[PDB]
């Protein structure tokens, strides 16, 4: 007897029979070796999508430049993706955009975005993902990269007194005007660097392999930039963020009711012969056909009447993208016929060691060589991942508010690379006319729709952001399984945090009640499997159940134990927002309650109730800067006991209010307190000697 699991789909919808077809339970695929060939295919494929040969030599950079706008060579295979943008066409789409809603649109949104840049501190640059520090030329979090950048500022010339976005970016432009920058290397020797290498290093973007990406056979390379390009991108994301929030045909922040209103609204505006066909579409190669020259052009049109600071200020990050460098990974490997000795050739010696490569590597390499640096590569038309995402959606709305003038048209909804298009027309060859005009406007603007991964029907049966929508019913987002148990901090913060995660997936997603009860008991099971705690009636005999089983006659009311202390579950689905201790302190024994909840414990001393909070041992496998800086942290935190709650205002001096603070509370505790001359005169001598030692 044969068997087929899919046969349930012969009599049911797809709103429930689609979580069957997600393999989200096993291990994600991971990368191996280097991420060099992926970047070579990305850059060589991007220049291979340029449809041009017209080059402009550079007098600033020692490498050539190939233009991308208004330089087309119309090949016959136009279904192949192109990388060319017509600028008067998209400016006509901008005037066609603003003529639909309002007149002072970019002026009002530019007054809001201009209104919310000057009141921003530059510490927002530290609240990000992993970045690329250029001091040791590695990947570090943003606090370390901003730390070494500000340290290079106060190390090379002068100090930093900015404390803003604008004076810090003007300080970066001052660093671009500096002829020589001194920073630290290795044990901290201060080396110097010239003017051109600072230019070649600040415009360097690192490429690695995207790890843990579900849904692709071939891996795709992700790129992380440095620090001196991030804040201008933050400015652009504030501007386009307010643009997308002001719009009504974007879904970057509810994503559900907008489809209800456009389906119900545009079905209310049909003729007696007109009808509607929707197409699910997915733009392929989305990150290789968005040249930042069009961002320079449109951001020169959005800011046409804004200011003088903002008009020059939104014209730097696309310029930094038009001359960006691409890292080449870490090289490759070479071995003999016996396959024993294998030398490793980096990206530096790849030019000299060209003759030890495969055919595919040499096909990607001979087509990339005249745009290579000695250690990096040059790109001027790409837009990789980790870049402008709230701004290409505006291009989606500009493609989705076109007027051609019958009375046949379209509307729809855009995402990062998914789009749902709603066409209204009369006949099927006229549907070919309207669809091929949509491919005309997207292809002329530079949005390359995949022809294999797009389809459509007459009513609502479409895909949007992995949410398959029926004619009446709605499927849910496929939830991540390993997001449930990744707390790993404490015997109290692993279960209640799991109740927070199951609570948030219950509110946000559908997440039927018995499924949440089952996942609750599974997470309870892995909690009792992690910390080796069993219920008292269970006959598990290890090094910790011996004490509990020995001392169980001391407890009168047995359900007053904790799950981390040898008790069964009392939390429920109606008790996910309440921790176990608050539910269980009303049934505890008073010797147990006074015994466990002692703050005089040798484990806690040296957002839940902390009674089991211990610290495990660190590993055994930049170490003076953490010592000095945490001396500043524990010192300034020790002076001001309430300072991690409020923002540390006051930038005139730190230690002057410290010295007047120790004089203040020493005199305050002194004058109708201590009263003894050697302590007040002694601490007075320490403050005076520290002030004369410091100020000189």
């Amino acid at each position: 007897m044969e068997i087929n699991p899919y046969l349930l789909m012969l009599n049911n919808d797809i709103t429930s029979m689609i979580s069957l077809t997600y393999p989200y339970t096993g291990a994600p695929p991971m990368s191996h070796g280097t991420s060099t060939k992926y970047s070579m295919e990305t850059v060589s494929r991007t220049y291979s999508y340029s449809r041009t040969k017209k080059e402009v030599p550079s007098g600033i950079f020692p490498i050539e430049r190939r233009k991308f706008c208004n330089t087309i060579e119309d090949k016959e295979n136009l279904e192949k993706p192109n990388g060319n943008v017509d600028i008067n066409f998209m400016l006509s789409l901008a005037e066609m955009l603003e003529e639909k809603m309002g007149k002072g649109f970019f002026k009002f949104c530019a007054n809001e975005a201009e209104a919310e840049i000057l009141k921003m501190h530059f510490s927002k640059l530290t609240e990000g993902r992993q970045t690329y520090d250029w001091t040791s030329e590695r990947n570090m979090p943003a606090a370390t990269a901003l730390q070494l950048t500000v340290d290079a500022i106060q190390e090379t010339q002068g100090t930093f007194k900015g404390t803003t976005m604008v004076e810090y970016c003007n300080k970066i432009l001052e660093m671009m005007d500096w002829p020589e920058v001194k920073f630290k290397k290795v044990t901290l020797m201060i080396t110097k660097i010239g003017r051109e290498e600072f230019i070649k290093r600040i415009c360097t973007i690192n490429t690695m392999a995207k790890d843990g990406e579900r849904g692709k056979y071939k891996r795709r390379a992700i790129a992380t930039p440095g620090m001196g390009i991030r804040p201008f991108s933050k400015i652009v994301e504030t501007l386009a963020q307010k643009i997308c929030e002001r719009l009504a045909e974007s879904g970057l922040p509810e994503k559900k009711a907008k489809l209800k209103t456009t389906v119900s609204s545009t079905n209310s505006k049909l003729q007696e012969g007109q009808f509607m066909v929707n197409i699910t579409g997915d733009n392929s190669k989305w990150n290789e056909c968005q040249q930042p020259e069009a961002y320079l052009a449109m951001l020169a049109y959005i800011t046409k009447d804004s200011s003088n600071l903002m008009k020059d200020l939104c014209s730097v990050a696309p310029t930094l993208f038009c001359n960006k460098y691409v890292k080449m990974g870490q090289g490759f490997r070479a071995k003999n016929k016996r396959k024993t000795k294998e030398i490793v050739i980096p990206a530096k010696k790849m030019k000299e060691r060209k003759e030890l490569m495969n055919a595919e590597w040499r096909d990607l390499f001979e087509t990339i060589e005249p745009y290579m640096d000695g250690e990096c590569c040059f790109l001027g038309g790409g837009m990789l991942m980790g870049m402008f995402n709230m701004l290409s959606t505006v291009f989606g709305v500009m493609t989705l508010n076109y007027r051609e003038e019958r009375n046949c048209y379209w509307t729809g909804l855009q995402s990062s690379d998914d789009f749902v298009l709603f066409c209204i027309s009369r006949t099927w060859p006229e549907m070919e006319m309207t669809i091929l005009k949509f491919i005309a406007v997207c292809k002329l603007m530079g949005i390359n729709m995949s022809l294999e991964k797009s389809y459509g029907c007459l009513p609502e049966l479409f895909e949007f952001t992995s949410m398959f929508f029926s004619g009446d019913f709605v499927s849910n987002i496929a939830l991540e399984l390993p997001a449930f148990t990744t707390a790993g901090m404490n015997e109290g913060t692993d279960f209640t945090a799991a109740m927070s995660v199951i609570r948030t997936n219950m509110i946000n997603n559908g997440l039927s009640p018995g499924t949440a009860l089952m996942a609750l008991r599974i997470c309870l099971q892995e909690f009792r499997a992690t910390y080796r705690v069993h219920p008292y009636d269970s006959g598990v005999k290890n090094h910790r159940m011996k004490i509990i089983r020995k001392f169980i006659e001391t407890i009168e009311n047995k359900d007053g134990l904790l799950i981390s202390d040898g008790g069964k579950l009392m939390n429920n689905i109606s008790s996910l927002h309440i921790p176990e201790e608050i539910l269980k302190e009303d049934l505890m024994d008073p010797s147990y309650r006074n015994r466990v909840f002692n703050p005089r414990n040798p484990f806690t001393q040296f957002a839940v109730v902390s009674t089991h909070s211990f610290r495990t041992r660190s590993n055994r496998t930049m170490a003076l800067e953490e010592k000095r800086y945490q001396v500043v942290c524990n010192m300034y935190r020790s002076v001001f006991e309430s300072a991690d709650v409020n923002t540390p205002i006051g930038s005139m001096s730190m230690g002057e209010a410290i010295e007047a603070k120790i004089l203040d509370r020493a005199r305050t505790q002194f004058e109708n307190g201590i009263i003894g001359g050697e302590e007040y005169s002694e601490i007075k001598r320490l403050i005076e000697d520290a002030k004369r030692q410091r100020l000189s």
Binding site: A143, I507, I548, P599, M654
Partner: protein
Amino acid sequence: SLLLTLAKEYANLTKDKKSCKLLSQGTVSSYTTFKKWTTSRKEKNPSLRMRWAMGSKFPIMANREILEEAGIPEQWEGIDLWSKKDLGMVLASPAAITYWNFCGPGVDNSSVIKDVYKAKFMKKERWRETLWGPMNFELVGKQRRVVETQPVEIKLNQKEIKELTMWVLFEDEANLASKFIQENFSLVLSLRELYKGKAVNKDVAAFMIAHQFSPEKRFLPTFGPIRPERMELLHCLGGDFWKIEAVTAVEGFQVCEYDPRAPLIPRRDLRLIGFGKKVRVFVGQGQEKTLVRTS
């Protein structure tokens, strides 16, 4: 310490030149990056590393003097609970944690814990005294709203709460005393008589005041009535294809200028050495002036 040795370690640990290049001549803003600076990059699998920790023999870094003051080195059958390695911090087992939980001393802390977490105990009291009934098994669906989900009786706007705690605990470096603060200054006048003498940590006091008064606004899918008592139970009351509910029911002082040689008298002696004098006031983060009382 008791504020006698902090000037000694302040004097001894400011002998560095780069400390003077940093303090009072560098970046005060970088303290906001000094708080979050450590080399803990991502910890991509923390529960895996905790599972590696619980599989070792003595993973726990615990204090020495308390457990050697009270505890016992080995249990009744070979259970090792100690180490002799190092600073003064001794590795230990969670069997010492549960041995503290069964054979440790007791400290009466009933009113403390039953006064810190009063919001969540009130959640338990309002959950204990509710009542349900039958279900519906009907279709339901409604858009997402912005609802504040806690039955508070003050309803600040997430800005007067930090400013309130600073203007209750330590009013010196606190914030402005603003025009949206005169009624809140009556609230401090009602709350200076509560948070004066406590054995509570200041971070815990800022936690309990920061949570007992704040209506937590969220962007959640709601349905039916939007009364905030039944909004924190939104995960229990409904799903997508089912619905269940059967609930039937004093320093009013002033400063003038900065010039005169004022007597060195702080805010503790601000009332008795108050009126008719030009008495200086040290305001917090560095702004210290001279005071004249204005009627």
